Ligand binder design. Structure first.
Ligand code: B12
Length: 577
């Protein structure tokens, strides 16, 4: 009554690993210990071997991320049984190199990091994950105390960039030699090699994904390749360094008053903005169930390094089946999560009468437009345009002078508060796979709410398009009137406004959601942003803004020209000073 249950305990483990079979993992790694002289053998023996297979497979493209992390789960849970035996014993094994991984300062994005985390322990490296919002201080300090071979920083929103760069200067100033590895949503070949590398005398590499992380972490710890690599990269980052400062025959940059002059043209006297049916701050609620439908799974599969869009990915050739299998496992966890009610999304919406003044929107107390309670600020494209507007989000709102009644809204949500709680649980039982799952869904769940609310606002709450029945697949294409710009995106790069949002809706109170040093959000699975109704409104990016606007924004916000240059760094069309 079994099958593989009659093999040598060593082939048994080696197989249970690849397949990712954890139901015998305890008594299997055990028995193999009794038949082994010293604890550490079952590790460098069956297990370690089980992993090279995965790795072999992963390479020909037979296996995938979903399973890999899944095999690790076994791999870990085994070493997690020999803790007391391996410890109280001889030598206790070794690795290819120990690494300090961490989500930089003020940032709370960590999914891509765990993956890299796990993908590396899967090639036998020791990974010390400090977590998120970690001081450039605690990163290197630990780099020191645990004698790491290389520091890895992870970033997600714009503000983090200045953190990494603050970390390199620190690595330059603190005389560090090891290699700096930088990654995350925001990092790029270019950004690393323009503003980061040239601050760290040591090797400073940028990698695009956990797969390629291994190739670099290899070369960077190779008695051979190291010298031959760091050097190929230094000279590579130079090439791109000089191609980005060629100041290509670029469209000359216009003056802040010119652009502003060339504003979004529209006859407002003739147009009457849709009265927002429901004025006021409201706390909405939706169960996972409700949300499930609105989930755009694509990003999900991109989270799990499975390329392609859904549902086309399911019928894919090389990866399709797994995509199917991965896709199931999730839904499965979702079912559980929706029933027991252990991960509940929350959210808060709101609609306030507004109007346009300069490049900002004025939010009004009551229908009277007598008292200003909050001012949403927006930047304005500052390149030379002809025939087209110099788009500035505020334009899509009936100015003050037109005395026309226009409106604006905002929201914030989250796939659940218990996100972190549930995540840690899996860390506990060493379930990397499920740790990364619960998070990847919360997101989907979060991102999901945003779509739902928006639709409901579009339908009910604001009520300008009550007879709307687009499909989920259509909602994914933005086939509706109006947008929902959110702080950070190119349409409105200034992250601090998320504060204002928190203010209007008093997020903290209705959802518990919070904001951090770098105006990121907690839980990680969160989405906040603005609601615009005017039909012409589009997600048009800011791009580069000159010195004049930064100043004028300075005042507006009531900040220092410098404090603004920080938060806006990406979009500075002039010399970053
Ligand atoms: C799922 C996602 C989210 C999630 C959450 C992730 C989290 N916080 O835990 C949700 C939907 C909730 C979210 C929220 C936000 N987001 Co978002 N999001 C995405 C999306 C669809 C997918 C990328 C993704 O997350 N991949 C999986 C992960 C985390 O992988 P990854 O970062 O790519 O990691 C891979 C490698 O980069 C690597 N890497 C990672 N770390 C390291 C470390 C080292 C050391 C090395 C060598 C390599 C490495 O590991 C991975 C592969 O093996 C992107 C897509 C895109 N299309 O570019 C935007 C995007 C990242 N988001 C963006 C922004 C604007 C925001 C918010 C401010 C929005 C809001 N609501 O107002 C907030 C973030 C604040 C917060 N959460 O506190 C921007 C960033 C632009 C900016 N602001 O500067 C992007 C690029 C959108 C665009 N086109 O501009 N987001």
């Amino acid at each position: 009554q079994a099958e593989w249950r009659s093999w040598e305990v060593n082939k048994r483990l080696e197989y249970s690993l690849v397949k990712g079979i954890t139901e015998f993992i305890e008594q299997d790694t055990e028995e193999a210990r009794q038949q082994a002289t010293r604890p550490i053998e079952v590790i460098e023996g069956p297990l370690m071997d089980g992993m090279n297979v995965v790795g072999d497979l992963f390479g020909e493209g037979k296996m995938f991320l979903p399973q890999v992390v899944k095999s690790a789960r076994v791999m870990k849970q085994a070493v997690a049984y020999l803790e007391p035996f391996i410890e109280a014993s001889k030598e206790q094994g070794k690795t290819n190199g120990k690494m300090v991984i961490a989500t930089v300062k003020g940032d709370v994005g960590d999914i891509g990091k765990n993956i890299v985390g796990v993908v590396l322990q899967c090639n036998n490296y020791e990974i010390v994950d400090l977590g998120v919002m970690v001081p450039a201080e605690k990163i290197l300090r630990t780099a020191k105390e645990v004698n790491a071979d290389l520091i890895g920083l992870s970033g997600l929103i714009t503000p983090s960039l200045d953190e990494m760069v603050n970390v390199a200067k620190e690595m330059e100033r603190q005389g560090f030699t090891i290699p700096l590895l930088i990654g995350g949503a925001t990092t790029s070949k270019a950004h690393t090699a323009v503003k980061i590398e040239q601050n760290y005398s040591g090797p400073t590499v940028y990698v695009q994904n956990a797969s390629r992380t291994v190739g670099v972490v290899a070369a960077l710890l190779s008695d051979t390749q190291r010298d031959d690599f760091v050097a190929r990269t230094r000279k590579e980052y130079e090439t791109v360094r000089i191609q980005h400062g060629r100041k290509k025959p670029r469209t000359p940059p216009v003056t802040l008053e010119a652009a502003r002059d060339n504003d979004f043209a529209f006859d407002w006297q003739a147009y009457t903005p849709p009265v927002a049916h429901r004025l006021g701050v409201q706390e909405v609620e939706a169960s996972i169930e409700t949300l499930r439908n609105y989930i755009d799974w694509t990003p999900f599969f991109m989270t799990w390094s499975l390329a392609g869009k859904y549902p086309r990915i399911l019928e894919d050739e090389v990866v399709g089946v797994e995509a199917q299998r991965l896709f199931k496992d999730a839904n499965d966890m979702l079912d559980k999560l929706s029933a027991e009610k252990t991960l509940n999304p929350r959210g808060v919406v709101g609609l306030f009468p507004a109007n346009r003044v300069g490049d900002d929107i004025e939010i009004y107390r009551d229908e009277t437009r007598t008292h200003v309670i909050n001012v949403s600020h927006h930047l304005r494209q500052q390149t030379e345009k002809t025939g087209f507007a110099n788009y500035c989000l505020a334009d899509f709102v009936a100015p003050k002078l037109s005395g026309k009644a226009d409106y604006i809204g905002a929201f914030a949500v989250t796939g659940g508060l218990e996100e972190d709680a549930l995540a840690d649980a899996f860390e506990a039982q060493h379930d990397d796979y499920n740790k990364i799952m619960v998070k990847a869904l919360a997101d989907r769940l979060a991102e999901a709410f945003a779509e739902y609310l928006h639709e409901r606002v579009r339908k009910v709450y604001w009520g300008y398009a009550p007879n709307e029945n687009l499909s989920n697949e259509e909602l994914i294409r933005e086939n509706y009137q109006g947008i929902r710009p959110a702080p950070g995106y190119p349409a409105c790069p200034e992250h601090t406004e998320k504060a204002t949002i928190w203010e209007l809706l008093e997020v903290e109170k209705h959802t518990g959601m919070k904001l951090t040093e770098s105006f990121a959000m907690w839980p990680g699975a969160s989405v906040s942003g603005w609601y615009f109704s005017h039909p012409d409104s589009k997600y048009y990016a800011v791009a580069q803004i000159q010195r004049d606007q930064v100043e004028d924004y300075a005042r507006r916000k009531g900040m220092s020209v410098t404090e603004v240059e920080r938060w806006l760094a990406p979009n500075l069309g002039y010399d970053a000073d």
